[PDB]
Amino acid sequence: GGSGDSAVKQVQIDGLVVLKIIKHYQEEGQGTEVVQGVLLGLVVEDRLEITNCFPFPQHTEDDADFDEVQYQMEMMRSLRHVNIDHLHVGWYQSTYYGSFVTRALLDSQFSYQHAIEESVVLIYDPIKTAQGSLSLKAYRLTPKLMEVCKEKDFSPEALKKANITFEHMFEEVPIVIKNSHLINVLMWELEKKSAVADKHELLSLASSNHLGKNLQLLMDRVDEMSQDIVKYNTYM
Amino acid sequence: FPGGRVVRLHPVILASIVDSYERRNEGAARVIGTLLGTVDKHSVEVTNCFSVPHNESEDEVAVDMEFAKNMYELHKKVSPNELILGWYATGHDITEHSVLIHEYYSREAPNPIHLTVDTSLQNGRMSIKAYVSTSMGVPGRTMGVMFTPLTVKYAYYDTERIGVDLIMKTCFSPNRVIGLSSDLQQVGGASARIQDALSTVLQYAEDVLSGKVSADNTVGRFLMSLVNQVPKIVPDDFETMLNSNINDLLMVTYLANLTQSQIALNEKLVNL
Amino acid sequence: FIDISEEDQAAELRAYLKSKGAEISEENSEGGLHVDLAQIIEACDVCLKEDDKDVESVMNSVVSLLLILEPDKQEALIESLCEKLVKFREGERPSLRLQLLSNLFHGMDKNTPVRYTVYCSLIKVAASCGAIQYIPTELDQVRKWISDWNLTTEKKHTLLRLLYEALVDCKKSDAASKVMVELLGSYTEDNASQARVDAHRCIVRALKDPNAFLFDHLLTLKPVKFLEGELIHDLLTIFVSAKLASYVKFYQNNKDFIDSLGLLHEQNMAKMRLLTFMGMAVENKEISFDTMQQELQIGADDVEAFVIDAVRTKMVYCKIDQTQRKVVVSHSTHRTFGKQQWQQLYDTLNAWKQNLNKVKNSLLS
Amino acid sequence: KLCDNLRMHLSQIQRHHNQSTAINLNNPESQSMHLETRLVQLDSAISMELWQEAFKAVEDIHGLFSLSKKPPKPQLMANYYNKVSTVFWKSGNALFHASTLHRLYHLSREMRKNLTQDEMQRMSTRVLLATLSIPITPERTDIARLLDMDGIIVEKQRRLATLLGLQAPPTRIGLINDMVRFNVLQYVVPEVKDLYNWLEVEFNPLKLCERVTKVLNWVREQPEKEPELQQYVPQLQSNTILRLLQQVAQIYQSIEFSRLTSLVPFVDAFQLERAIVDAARHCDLQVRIDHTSRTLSFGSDLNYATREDAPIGPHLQSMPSEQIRNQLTAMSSVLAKALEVIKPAHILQEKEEQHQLAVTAYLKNSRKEHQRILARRQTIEERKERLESLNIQREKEELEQREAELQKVR
């Protein structure tokens, strides 16, 4: 077997989910934090197979703001009623920072993982595109903090939890290792998009050239690293 | 010139049709849904789509358009760019039963967009065949089947274009995402290697006796332009400036490891 | 009009709509059907009797377009109904007829009177806003199958001639012309009665258009090797002047024929691009300022403005330094064997750039 | 005054303290509360130089345009947009003024159907002001920010843009393209029709001064020609010279200033070499002017950085030259060497037909297995709700068992 701690297995995210993630643009503005959708999937061969997602919207006029769960309830029935399921084993976001598991995402995750333990959180490398490694990140919450879950303490009572010394460099599972079995219709797109005409391949390849020559990519990443990281360093 | 002629489809339509056709939706080989997106006057700009409660049989059709109101209300909130456009189906293009789906869609006001995804093994089928009605006048028996065929131009909005190519590479060979820019590197010099194969064949066509009509001045323009891009022009001032830029980039890449080391050292003393 | 979810009683189903049309189409509806459940006799009426613009008839024409080609001839009855589109002289609604009958649907293409007849109709009936729309799909299907019946390649050369004549736009006309001329030396119309008289009109386009460079779309592929220049066409008389750097050449090589088409003024332009390119090709990287001025035999700040015209042309393209590098290496004009030997260099040059560097790259990662 | 007239507005808008006359239908009262004091508030504020009170008096109407939403628009709507342009120029910017002329244009194109007129003089005047006044200033530079922390200061762009009806402020040369999409280049006056053919269409880095000198100096004649225009053109002329200098930073590597003086005529030669310093200090470019031999150096690449270009879109024409940056060689080595196989080749059609045969063989083999996948996935997917709902709910119910076991030991 290949399990971590507790009953939760490794995740896999089907390309059909990744395209439904990527249909949402980067363009909210400069940047604001929103949970962009829930991840729906089931325990199968080696993994939790995420089969599909529906995007979970929020108000985006300047700041973000919430709305009634009439969306999620009606939309999780909309996925059920074609053929029968509702299976929220995680959620995802594509916010500007890079990949970054903030204290609020840890609190939102703590409420999520204590309620349903067969779950993971997803982040994706945005149109920010530094792109060296790991375009998709998984992360589970440790069982050792979930055993002491209600809320944290604005007082020294946290010291009894701190002496468990639970992980904060904890393991992240490898999402993709083997074929998702629904590769097969998009495999049959490739010959039609490649063998007979130049019209449809080159527009996916042209992006790399201008990821090098265009304005200040690594320079702006190291500039934001000169701003994000020194603010965290000074704080500690 | 009168109207719609071409569809500008893209990957998430096909992914949502396949994620409706596989899995299941009551019908086995025959599955249906309402496509969403927008149009621009001769082109269709299909943006995303979702399936609907359905059952087609050799004497029956069920389009619960009330669910395509709910799903449309929901997907309007997801992004303003969608509109109820038409419908999509699997397996076959022409039947008498398909005239019923046009009546169910004629209960909405706009121009219809009938898409058939024809999942044959054969290369003689284009994967999705696109149609729209003509001679849509005033009521005869039900509705007409003299459809105008549509071409494809693909090429909708940006970020999705990398998403399908990552999946197409995965369809050829399954691989782990930590290597992706090293994979772009080692297929980089492979392009220069298969270029060394083709450039040989284009030289070799003049070497043997006669040929090379497939190349000459177009390949000459390609190669002159290629060396005017990569590398640049060839003074040694460029070599030293290239070296100073690598010594700066290396000093920056070094300083990123110096900051990893100090991200550690402050994280470490507070843990005592 | 009534929609087709009626039974496909083809001749009767089409004829039922003629009764809603003209009275002369109705007495040939009744007389066409009572004689026989007919073929050609029912199938030709709306193609001959008036069907005129004061009423719409696209709906019943579309019912004719699918129901004539099946029970009788496709190839003859598709030529019918196209005559009347060209006669009414309206572009919008005939284009709906011609668009419904798209290629490779409602039957088969039959190699290929339908696309010829339909493209011939869309070129002759309407403005460029319609006529341009079939050019990619027809030049693709010309590559997917070039017509084995030679006369049909003469007819689709004739459609490319109607294309370059219906186009008022010089560069689309030069494109549609040079596309026909690329095929003209390959396979058909290559006779002295056809290709060799079109060579004159190719010299008219090549001399008069300053965007032709001078000879580059004639040297790049077959046309100069097929159409003679030391014949009294005088095609290679451009290749003479394009090497030889003066207004003197063309002015002395001349005739009253080509001068009467406008040649007197444009001969000044050849000297610019040939000296601006070929001087930088001989020096190879970094030319000095007085050399450009004394090759072109003109001023200093005029050569600044002509380096701008060369930059607009992309005959040169990078930053220009002010005493040396007055023009810069973005080579784009003809240097026939100098470009072939540098391609003969390039595989050997690339051999390290593809092995040696990849032996470091793929090793490291 | 203003705080008391605002206090009167606040006492009635939604308070409904008594039967007092509703804003929602009684037009004679409602339009008196929207317009008739507030036109004079704004005019009095800007005439007395009270810029903050004047902006509070555009917020005084916008605080009705967000609340009084069920009645129709107020009568002769054009009287807002044609006036507010002169306060929004000084309190905002010339760009927001020119965008207000776009809002005025797209409204008054139709509103002349109720504002009945047959005057020819207004037609060409409306468009000539609305296209020409756009390029004038992007550089409201960050010197008000850089000396202290970053903050959430994006508000200060958003508030101005919100009064024009946008979540973000106006955006570069595309604001002219959105006009030239229509008959604007033929409604515009014959003396200025061709101006943007010289300023942006024809790619002329150092041969434009001969064309623009007549058209610009002729629109600089103010006494019959809308005097506000000649408060944009004087700097449009120097901004066009900066468009030459910014394109020439991408087209020249060096120049003796005695040659550049003959290529680019200006008001004073010493002030043209100052303008090159001034634009470089303002980060529009970066160049060695002020030099010993009086040779300007732009550099071929050097330590190339984005100060040498406009990053906000390109204000210079779309002819940058070649420069080095990360992966410039590498990614070109992937694609351009493959495109010189994918576009021309005799070879690759056989290889990619063999790949089509492999794709076809994968499907030919695996669509036989679809018969074995189908019935299993169908029964599993039918049962998945019936099965997994017995597992996913258990962390709801176990709370009472945990509490009872704790209470038992207690």
CB A213 within 8 A of CB D325: yes
User: At what angle are helices D51-65 and D38-47 packed, to 10 degrees?
Assistant: 160
- CA angle A185/C104/C64 to nearest 5° reads 130
Helices (H), D168-321: 174-180, 184-187, 195-196, 209-219, 233-248, 257-263, 269-281
Say which amino acid occupies D195.
Answer: L
Q: Is the peptide bond before C112 cis (omega within 30 degrees of 0)?
A: yes
Tell me how far apart the alpha carbons of residues A30 and A32 are, in angstroms, rounded to a whole number. 7
CB B43 within 8 A of CB B196: no
The residues with which B25 forms a beta bridge, in sequence order, are B27
Chains that touch A (3 or more CB pairs under 8 A): B, D
Say which amino acid occupies C282.
Answer: V
Which residues on B lie below 8 Å from D361 (Cβ)? none
Q: What resolution (Å)?
A: 2.9
CA nearest neighbour of B130 among B104, B93, B179, B160: B93
Q: CA of D363, closest CA in chain A: separation in Å?
A: 7
Tell me how far apart the alpha carbons of residues B225 and B219 are, in angstroms, rounded to a whole number. 10
Structure tokens at D191: 């003396």
Contact B263/A229, CB-based, under 8 Å?
Answer: yes
Tell me how far apart the alpha carbons of residues C342 and C349 are, in angstroms, rounded to a whole number. 10
Instruction: Name the residue facing B159 among A22, A174, A176 (closest C-beta).
Output: A22
Contacts of D81 (CB under 8 A, 6+ apart): D100, D103, D104, D107, D108
Nearest CA in chain D to C312: D203
DSSP string, D10-57: HTTSS---SSPPPTTT-HHHHHIIIIITHHHHHHHHHHTT-HHHHHHH
Q: How many CA atoms lie within 13 A of D263 on its CB side?
A: 25
- The residue among D304, D325, D337, D363 with the most chain B CBs within 10 A of its CB, best to mutate, is D337
Structure tokens at B90: 């699997």
Question: 3-state class of D326 per DSSP?
Answer: coil
Contact D346/B191, CB-based, under 8 Å?
Answer: no
The residues with which C360 forms a beta bridge, in sequence order, are none
CB B8 within 8 A of CB B44: yes
- DSSP symbol at B113: -
Tell me how far apart the alpha carbons of residues A81 and A86 are, in angstroms, rounded to a whole number. 10
- The residue among D325, D326, D333 with the most chain B CBs within 10 A of its CB, best to mutate, is D333
Contact C321/D253, CB-based, under 8 Å?
Answer: yes
Tell me how far apart the alpha carbons of residues A25 and C87 are, in angstroms, rounded to a whole number. 52
- Label the pairing between strands B114-117 and B128-133: antiparallel
Q: Does B225 touch chain C (CB under 8 A)?
A: yes
Say which amino acid occupies D114.
Answer: N
Q: List phi, psi (to 5°) of B112.
A: -85, 155
Which residues on D lie below 8 Å from C322 (Cβ)? 252-256, 259, 295
Q: CA of C155, closest CA in chain B: separation in Å?
A: 25
Q: Does A159 touch chain D (CB under 8 A)?
A: no
Tell me how far apart the alpha carbons of residues B171 and A189 are, in angstroms, rounded to a whole number. 10
> What is the rounded end-to-end Cα distance, in angstroms, of chain D?
71
Tell me how far apart the alpha carbons of residues B268 and B169 are, in angstroms, rounded to a whole number. 42
Contacts of B228 (CB under 8 A, 6+ apart): C329, C330, C331, D322
Tell me how far apart the alpha carbons of residues D184 and D178 are, in angstroms, rounded to a whole number. 10
Tell me how far apart the alpha carbons of residues B2 and B111 are, in angstroms, rounded to a whole number. 13
CB C77 within 8 A of CB C68: yes
Structure tokens at B61: 């059709």
Question: 3-state class of D375 per DSSP?
Answer: helix
Q: List phi, psi (to 5°) of D41.
A: -55, -55
- CA angle C118/C121/C124 to nearest 5° reads 150
Contact D311/A216, CB-based, under 8 Å?
Answer: yes
CB B8 within 8 A of CB B154: yes
Structure tokens at D331: 């990614």
Nearest CA in chain B to D303: B245
Nearest CA in chain B to D322: B229
Chains that touch D (3 or more CB pairs under 8 A): A, B, C
CB C69 within 8 A of CB C107: yes
Q: Is B60 left (phi over 0), alpha (psi -120 to 50) or beta?
A: beta
CA nearest neighbour of C195 among C235, C168, C163: C235
Question: 3-state class of C122 per DSSP?
Answer: helix
Sign, Cα dihedral of A102, A104, A110, A116: negative
Tell me how far apart the alpha carbons of residues C216 and D244 are, in angstroms, rounded to a whole number. 32
Contact D206/C312, CB-based, under 8 Å?
Answer: no
Tell me how far apart the alpha carbons of residues B162 and D194 are, in angstroms, rounded to a whole number. 42
Burial class of residue B17 (count of CB atoms within 10 Å of its CB; 0-12, 13-18, 19+): buried
- Label the pairing between strands B83-84 and B87-90: unpaired
Element at B33 (helix H, strand E): strand B32-40
Q: Which of residues 33-72 of C touch B (CB under 8 A)?
A: 58-59, 62-63, 66
Q: Does C140 touch chain B (CB under 8 A)?
A: no
Nearest CA in chain C to D210: C305
Q: CA of A128, closest CA in chain D: separation in Å?
A: 15
Q: CA of A199, closest CA in chain B: separation in Å?
A: 8
Q: Does A130 touch chain B (CB under 8 A)?
A: no
Say which amino acid occupies C302.
Answer: D
Q: List phi, psi (to 5°) of A16.
A: -60, -30
Contact D330/B188, CB-based, under 8 Å?
Answer: yes
Long-range contacts of D82-87 (CB under 8 A, 24+ apart): D83/D39, D83/D42, D84/D42, D84/D58, D86/D46, D86/D228, D87/D42, D87/D46, D87/D54, D87/D55, D87/D58
Nearest CA in chain A to B76: A57
Structure tokens at B163: 């998403």
Sign, Cα dihedral of C335, C341, C346, C352: negative
DSSP string, A112-148: HHHH-SS-EEEEE--TT---SS-SEEEE---HHHHTT
CB B10 within 8 A of CB B42: no
- Residue pairs spanning A and B at CB distance below 8 A: 164
CA nearest neighbour of C76 among C104, C110, C26, C28: C110
Structure tokens at C226: 């097929």
Buried (b) or exposed (e) across D195-213, using 16+ Cβ within 10 A?
A: bbebbbeebbbbbbbebbe
CA nearest neighbour of C54 among C21, C14, C19: C21
Q: Does C285 touch chain B (CB under 8 A)?
A: yes
Longest dimension (CA), chain C: 93
CA nearest neighbour of D136 among D173, D185, D183: D173
Contact B195/D337, CB-based, under 8 Å?
Answer: yes
Structure tokens at D282: 């303002």
CB B100 within 8 A of CB A77: no
Element at D356 (helix H, strand E): helix D348-392
- Residue pairs spanning B and D at CB distance below 8 A: 83
Structure tokens at A7: 């009953």
Structure tokens at D204: 């002329």
Instruction: Name the residue facing B195 among D303, D332, D340 (closest C-beta).
Output: D340
| CA distances to A35, B24, D84, D182, D233 from D172, in Å | 33, 50, 22, 18, 17
- Label the pairing between strands B43-51 and B147-149: unpaired
Q: Which of residues 182-201 of B touch C (CB under 8 A)?
A: 182, 185-186, 188-190, 192-193, 195-196, 199-200
Contact D331/A227, CB-based, under 8 Å?
Answer: no
What is the number of other CB atoms lying within 10 angstroms of the CB of residue D332? 20
Which residues on B lie below 8 Å from A191 (Cβ)? 123
